[PDB]
């Protein structure tokens, strides 16, 4: 069903990085593997990718470079399931990286953050059969 | 040992389409993207579209949209560029190259095809 | 479609030399970049992978440098078998577009 390497969960499959990318570098890597960046719209899909990137600052296919926050799947953001860090997205500027947090990831309890989306984390790839 | 197999070369009318075949051994079919690539004699090379066999999505370049064609048949690993309404300027040498990835870093077209010459003349 | 600029479009060198092709790319594509050789009659080669990265059998002469939107490939010492034409091509996003290629011949 899924290629090798990648795992299986509810009609998805999924591809975990071991390196970092930059945000856009790795929605195109996952665009080129013909698929995108986890798009996450539930607790059982959370949990599962929870379960296979540990405690690890990875990204997901959550951004607000269009303007409003967007998955880039098209999945409607403000209707859907969200798992903020408190206090999160804050746009947060005091980072000295230049400019604000445009891009959302995982933090090491699953909880997500915004972060300046040059940040070399590791992502996960989704596609969906 | 990774082969990407060609048809043979093409003589066409313009108005007319062809289809070239590109037979792919020594890997998982369904791994890899199928791209297509075309040199126009004396000129650089352009790409004309990409299927993934797994999923059977395409994409092709803007120029040829509704103009070509790419499939795959997973039962014979072989994937298929049909370019239809030809003309004089699709004179080239078509070429389908497999795009293999280093994981987590990049792609790249590791395996290419022989190259199919298309002749379209009247 | 993004726009690659490959320079210069023709050199001239004798065996053994230093060659130096560089590759402008009009957006940033991080090290989504390969590098390819062809010659007369023959499909490309690839050389270069991840901008930077030797592709598997391919001579340690050749290398690749550089990200964002500007790269290089460099054979260190010409090779007799090493004059051809070489390609440089972006993997980022669609279409993938390629350099216009550079036309390495022999000096005399």
């Known amino acids: 069903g899924c290629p090798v390497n990648w795992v299986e969960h509810e009609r998805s499959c999924y591809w975990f990085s071991r390196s970092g990318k930059a945000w856009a570098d790795a929605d195109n890597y996952c665009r080129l593997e013909d698929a995108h960046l986890v798009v996450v719209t539930s607790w059982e899909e959370q949990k599962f990718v929870q379960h296979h990137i540990g405690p690890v600052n990875t990204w997901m296919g959550l951004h607000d470079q269009n303007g409003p926050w967007k998955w880039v799947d098209g999945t409607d953001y403000e209707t859907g399931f969200k798992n903020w860090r408190p206090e999160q997205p804050d746009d947060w500027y005091g980072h000295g990286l230049g400019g604000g947090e445009d891009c959302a990831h995982f933090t090491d309890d699953g909880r997500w953050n915004d972060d300046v989306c040059q940040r070399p984390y590791r992502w996960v790839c989704e596609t969906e059969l | 040992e990774v082969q990407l197999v060609q048809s043979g070369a093409e003589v066409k009318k313009p108005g007319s389409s062809v289809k070239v075949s590109c037979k792919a051994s020594g890997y998982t079919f369904t791994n890899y993207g199928i791209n297509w690539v075309r040199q126009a004699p004396g000129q650089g090379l352009e790409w004309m579209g990409e299927?993934?066999?797994?999923?059977?999505?395409?994409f092709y370049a803007q120029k040829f949209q509704g103009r070509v064609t790419i499939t795959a048949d997973k039962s014979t690993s072989t994937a298929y560029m049909e370019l239809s309404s030809l003309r004089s300027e699709d004179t080239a040498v078509y070429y389908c190259?497999?795009?293999?990835?280093?994981?987590?870093?990049?792609?790249?077209?590791?395996?290419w095809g022989q190259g199919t010459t298309v002749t379209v003349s009247s | 479609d993004i726009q690659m600029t490959q320079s210069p479009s023709s050199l001239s060198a004798s065996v053994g030399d230093r060659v130096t092709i560089t590759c402008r790319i009009s957006?940033?594509?991080?090290?989504?970049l390969a590098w390819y050789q062809q010659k007369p009659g023959k499909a490309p080669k690839l050389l270069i992978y991840a901008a930077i990265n030797l592709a598997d059998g391919v001579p340690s002469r050749f290398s690749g440098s550089g990200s964002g939107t500007d790269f290089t490939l460099t054979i260190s010492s010409l090779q007799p078998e090493d004059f051809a034409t070489y390609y440089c091509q972006h993997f980022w996003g669609t279409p993938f577009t390629f350099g216009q290629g550079t036309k390495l011949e022999i000096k005399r």
């Open positions: 190259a497999r795009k293999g990835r280093d994981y987590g870093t990049s792609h790249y077209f590791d395996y």
């Open positions: 957006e940033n594509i991080y090290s989504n």
């Open positions: 299927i993934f066999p797994r999923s059977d999505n395409t």
